[PDB]
Amino acid sequence: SLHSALMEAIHSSGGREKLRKVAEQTSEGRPKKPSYVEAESERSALLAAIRGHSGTLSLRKVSSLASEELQSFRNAALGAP
Amino acid sequence: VAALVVDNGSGMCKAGFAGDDAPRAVFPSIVGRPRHQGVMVGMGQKDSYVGDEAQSKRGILTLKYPIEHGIVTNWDDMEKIWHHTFYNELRVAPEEHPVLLTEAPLNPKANREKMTQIMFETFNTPAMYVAIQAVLSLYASGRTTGIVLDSGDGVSHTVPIYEGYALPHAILRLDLAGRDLTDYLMKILTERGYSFTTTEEREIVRDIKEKLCYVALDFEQEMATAASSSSLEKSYELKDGQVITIGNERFRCPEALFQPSFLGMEACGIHETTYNSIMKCDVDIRKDLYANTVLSGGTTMYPGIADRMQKEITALAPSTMKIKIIAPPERKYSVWIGGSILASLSTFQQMWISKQEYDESGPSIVHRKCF
Amino acid sequence: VAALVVDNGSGMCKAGFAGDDAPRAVFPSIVGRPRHQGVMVGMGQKDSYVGDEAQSKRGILTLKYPIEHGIVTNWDDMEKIWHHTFYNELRVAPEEHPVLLTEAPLNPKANREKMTQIMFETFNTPAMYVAIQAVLSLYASGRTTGIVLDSGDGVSHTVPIYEGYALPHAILRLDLAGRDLTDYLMKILTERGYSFTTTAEREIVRDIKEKLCYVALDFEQEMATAASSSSLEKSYELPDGQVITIGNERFRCPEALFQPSFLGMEACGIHETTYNSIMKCDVDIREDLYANTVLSGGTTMYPGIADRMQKEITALAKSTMKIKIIAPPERKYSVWIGGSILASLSTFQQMWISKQEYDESGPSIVHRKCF
Ligand SMILES: Nc1ncnc2c1ncn2[C@@H]1O[C@H](COP(=O)(O)OP(=O)(O)NP(=O)(O)O)[C@@H](O)[C@H]1O
Ligand SMILES: Nc1ncnc2c1ncn2[C@@H]1O[C@H](COP(=O)(O)OP(=O)(O)NP(=O)(O)O)[C@@H](O)[C@H]1O
Ligand SMILES: [Mg+2]
Ligand SMILES: [Mg+2]
């Protein structure tokens, strides 16, 4: 199909800013990047987030051998060498 | 061989060559003509100026803004802009290159034909194509399905897109965007004890906005911090050297996006508008909208907007629903970049409308090569 | 798509994924290599064991600690741990994830470069970033300004922090923490009548400390009560059921933190060390440090430690000063939890050191991503 191929080419083929003439080849993260050229506003935005993020509560629950003692506030077993 | 991509915004026109990673030309969408018909100690022959020199010569001209709220309101003015773009800015021959143009969501069918008429009859283009701005954003981030919030100078849209096509019924227009914030920022600075009102003072505020403003994850708590300390305070270096101090205004400004009551608007809020669109789609595709909510346009450029969006939508959604917000650092020119990618793909090369196809079918062929 | 968070302690290494509410892998910072038996045909096992398997096979191995007093003192052995963490513990590819590393306050500039070198050259990471452990703990409690007492295995630190920056000049280090206290319990229990010195007996004493020890609100009063009564005594069963009874040692052991002289140290005590740091800072940030004293690290886990800190600091400080001690229940893992919150924030995603940035700037680029 004429359409199907283009859709695949947007996803698959370099549908990214690997275009040409001074760009950002590689970028990473856990989520995305709310941002502008002014690093001052960015830091303001970052610190406001640290202050605003909810606790461990907001985070992804995990079943770890250790973290188990965290979900039950106080516990302990073997602490450190 | 090389395509042209022209993204016409209400504020700024962005132009350049497909395959580049950025536009070569970015200028104000402004046409200026001399006030008073015949007479002048004007200049050479120039019955018109476009972009910055129109702005510089405001004092001799009557200025017009042809593309108000994303929709063209004068085709003569629009033709002046495109003319300027090809010859003055990119310095190419229209008739040598296929050209891709963009349009706002919910663009009247009349206008879509006019765009095509002018491109072939006035500018003699070998080929051309028309793309919905919002759709190109999505493409720029390697996706063909999702919802994009595209907010610029004059208007904001949430646009649900499925497998390449925008969904007209679920497109919501939010009558609030960049220049409502510029204005709002002036208001709250005036209140503080400063004074901005003149259209030159505006351009100053607009610079503050783009440099100092940000979105707080928790607005109330941030208001609390700003009230009980001066740690959030920054001072801005003016042209005439009058160093101005700005506090809680930095974040109360972009907050208007989430609380339009700050603007005397009874409206909805970008996060709630996004949610309402998602809800206007069929239950069976909503998941993909949630997991692919894309941000584009200068007004989405405030740092911290993404995490906040994420949190605001999660608060409206069901449980466990994977909410992913994509806000790339280049999102100001996502629409253009998307355009550049598309037109430079080989699978796109037969998608174009050719001169030949136009000669037989006429302006209305554009409908067949879109929705 | 998901980032890694790695908190390298002098005792325990903690790893996991940015966004999780807790680390996945927690294991000893021990590298064991096989000791030479002095034999002819000496083939058989591996050349290195790391963490748990190094611990169990300790009899046949010489164990080393690459990172002492929070500072890495062996880079070859450190690399072993890091390798082991990515592959055997997390079972992910280094090259596919951005990695958040942590460091002791006042970690030498030399060591910071070496960390960054190893992350891009040896482990070919996309991105990485280095944070001071103490700062993360403060973040973990949702604050950007305050003071943290971080007390772990080998070392205790007081770290005044302003809006995300640690203030090195007001940082004070105290060479007394967890293992010093374990040592002291061994000493005092032996004098009571028991005997612990073999390294298998230490691990038992350490278990007693973490389970039965507490901090007295009033030490002299608590000694008095303990001398006129057995009500404060507790029993501890061994593996071989030799029920040992422990009395005032329960609060005398943690007391060393407040009276280092108990250990024959001329040092100062966590409450006074905290106070001195605050006093090295300017008047205008002191109120904020005093109302936001955060406890973090394993050695701050004692019941009653915060109330005591509150009482002790209130005494040392000016009157009318609001003293607030924050002791979150998860504080054993705050350094990590904090780093998980950080590296999972959207507002953080442009803060990384990219592979690109490293290739043009070199190891020393790390110094540029803090100050
Ligand atoms: N970092 C920034 N923070 C806040 N606002 C910004 C930033 N950068 C640009 N803007 C604003 O973004 C608006 C223009 O966005 P843009 O999408 O480029 O305009 P446009 O497409 O030409 N006009 P429209 O038709 O309304 O989309 C202006 O109001 C600018 O003030
Ligand atoms: N509940 C507890 N009560 C008392 N001590 C504890 C408790 N849990 C752990 N510890 C002690 O905490 C110390 C080390 O804890 P930890 O904060 O993990 O240090 P670390 O980060 O591994 N090394 P460092 O880099 O020096 O901080 C050990 O001496 C343990 O005995
Ligand atoms: Mg636009
Ligand atoms: Mg530690």
Segments making up each domain of chain C, as ranges: 1-133+335-369, 134-175+268-334, 176-267
**DSSP letter at B84?**
I
- DSSP string of B4-68, one letter each residue: EEEEE-SSEEEEEEBTBSS-SEEEE--EEEESSSS--S--SS-S-EETHHHHHTTTTEEEE-SEE
Which subunits count as partners of chain B given 3+ CB pairs below 8 Å? A, C
Alpha-carbon distance of C38 to C89, in angstroms, equals 33
Q: Which residues of C touch A36 (CB under 8 A)?
A: none
CA angle C265, C269, C271 (to 5 degrees): 175
Nearest residue of chain A to residue C28 (CA atoms): A81
- Distance, CA C9 to ligand 4 centroid (Å)? 5
B221 shares contact with chain C (CB less than 8 Å) = no
Q: Residue C325's beta-bridge partner residues? A: C293
Contacts of C345 in chain B (CB under 8 A): 307
Pull the structure tokens for residue B204.
């100053």
* CATH of region B1-133+335-369: 3.30.420.40
Distance CA A35, CA A14 (A): 24
Residues C104/C342, Cβ–Cβ less than 8 Å: no
- C198: buried, middle or exposed (CB in 10 Å: 19+, 13-18, 0-12)? exposed
Atom of ligand 2 nearest to the CA of C11: 22
How many whole angstroms from C118 Cα to the centroid of ligand 3? 44
Question: B312: which 2 tokens?
Answer: 């605001």
What method did the depositors use to determine the structure? X-ray
Mutant choice from C161, C322, C347 vs B, greatest count of B C-beta within 10 A: C347
Q: Which ligand is nearest to the CA of C208?
A: 2
Q: Is the CB of B271 under 6 A from ligand 1?
A: no
Residue nearest to atom 29 of ligand 2 (CA): C178
| SS3 letters across chain C | CCCEEEEECCCEEEEEEECECCCCEEEECCEEEECCCCCCCCCCCCCCEECHHHHHCHHHEEEECCEECCEECCHHHHHHHHHHHHHHHCCCCHHHCCEEEEECCCCCHHHHHHHHHHHHCCCCCCEEEEEEHHHHHHHHCCCCCEEEEEECCCCEEEEEEECCEECHHHCEEECCCHHHHHHHHHHHHHHHCCCCCCHHHHHHHHHHHHHHCCCCCCHHHHHHHHHCCCCCCEEECCCCCCCEEECCHHHHHHHCCCCHHHHCCCCCCHHHHHHHHHHHCCHHHHHHHHCCEEEECHHHCCCCHHHHHHHHHHHHCCCCCCCCEECCCCHHHHHHHHHHHHCCCHHHCCCCEEHHHHHHHCHHHHHHCCC
Ligand 1 pocket member B23 (CB < 6 A): no
Q: How far is A78 from chain B (nearest CA, A)?
A: 34
C99-103 and C4-8: which strand pairing?
parallel
Indicate which residue's Cα is closest to atom 27 of ligand 1: B152
Q: Which residues pair with C166 in a beta bridge?
A: C161
Q: How far apart are CA B100 and CA B316, in angstroms?
A: 38
Distance, in Å, from the CA atom of C343 to the CA atom of C336, rounded to the nearest integer, reads: 11
The tokens describing C339, both together, are 């780093």
Distance between Cα C32 and ligand 3 center (Å): 61
CA distance C185 to C181: 6
Fold match flag (C1-133+335-369 vs C176-267) = no
Show Cβ contacts of residue C11 under 8 Å, excluding neighbours closer than 6 positions. A79, A80, A81, C28, C29, C152, C153, C154, C178, C179, C298
Of B229, B231, B306, the CB nearest to C346: B306
How far apart, in whole angstroms, are the C-alpha atoms of residue C121 and residue C47? 23
Residue minimizing CA distance to atom 2 of ligand 1: B210
Chains that touch C (3 or more CB pairs under 8 A): A, B
CB atoms within 10 A of CB B194: 16
Interhelix angle B270-279/B305-314, nearest 10 degrees? 50
CB atoms under 10 Å from CB of A5, counted, come to 13
Crossing angle between the packed helical segments B199-212 and B178-192, to the nearest 10 degrees: 100
CA C74-C75-C76 angle, to 5 degrees, is 100
Residue nearest to atom 15 of ligand 2 (CA): C298
User: Which residues on C lie below 8 Å from A73 (Cβ)?
Assistant: 329-330
Nearest to C317 by CA among C350, C352, C344, C290: C290
**How close B47 gets to chain A, by Cα (Å)?**
36
From chain A residues 5-64, the ones with a CB under 8 A of any chain B CB are 5-11, 13-17, 19-24, 27, 31-36, 38, 40-42, 44-46, 48-49, 51-53
Alpha helices in chain B (DSSP H): 52-56, 75-83, 109-117, 133-140, 178-192, 199-212, 219-227, 249-255, 270-279, 286-290, 305-314, 334-343, 355-361, 365-368
Residue B70's contacts (CB-CB under 8 Å, 6 or more residues apart) are B9, B10, B103, B104, B105, B107, B133, B152, B154, B155, B157
Answer whether CATH 3.30.420.40 is correct for domain C134-175+268-334.
yes
Residues within 8 A of A (CB atoms), B 89-148 only: 139-144
- Classify residue B19 by burial, with Cβ atoms within 10 Å: 0-12, 13-18, 19+: middle
Alpha-carbon distance A4 to nearest alpha carbon in chain C (angstroms): 27
Strand order in the sheet with C127-132: C25-28, C12-17, C4-8, C99-103, C127-132, C353-354
Q: Among residues 179-208 of chain B, which lie with CB inside 8 Å of chain C?
A: none
Per the DSSP assignment, residues forming a β-bridge with B79 are none
Q: Do residue C346 and residue B329 have CB atoms under 8 angstroms apart? A: no
Report the alpha-carbon distance of residue B77 to residue B10 in Å, rounded. 13
- Encoded tokens for A14: 């370099």
Check if C365 contacts A (Cβ < 8 Å): no
A63: which residues sit within 8 A by CB, 6+ positions away?
none
One-letter amino acid for residue C77 of the chain: D
Interchain pair B214, A45: CB under 8 A: yes
Burial class, B51, CB count within 10 angstroms (exposed 0-12 / middle 13-18 / buried 19+): buried
How far apart CA A27 and CA C353 sit, in angstroms, is 10
Q: Give the number of beta-carbon pairs within 8 Å between B and C.
A: 15
Measured CA to CA, the distance from residue B118 to residue A41 in angstroms comes to: 43
Of residues B144, B84, B192, B191, the one with CA closest to residue B289: B144
Alpha-carbon gap: B60 to the closest alpha carbon of chain A (Å): 35
Query: Look-up: residue for tokens 């709630």?
Result: B272
Burial class (CB in 10 A: 0-12, 13-18, 19+), A57: exposed
Q: Which residues line ligand 2 (CB under 6 A)?
A: A 76, 79-80; C 9-12, 70, 152-155, 178-179, 182, 206, 209-210, 297-299, 301-302, 332
| Tokens 């495109």 belong to residue | B82
Tell me A60's DSSP state: B
Interface of C with A in 212-271 (CB under 8 A): none
CA C349 to chain B, closest CA, distance in angstroms equals: 10
Residue found by looking up tokens 């007001």 in the block: C170
Three-state secondary-structure class, residue A39: helix
Q: How far is CA B267 from CA B178, B297, C14, C104, C143, in A?
A: 16, 20, 48, 50, 34
Class of domain C176-267: alpha beta
Residue C203: phi, psi to the nearest 5?
A: -55, -30
Q: Enter the tokens of residue B310.
A: 């994420």
Pocket test for ligand 2, best of C210, C215, C336 (most atoms within 8 A of CB): C210
Residue B302 touches partner A, C-beta closer than 8 Å: yes
Dihedral, B363, B364, B368, B370 alpha carbons, nearest 10: 70
CA of B323 to the centre of ligand 3 (A): 25
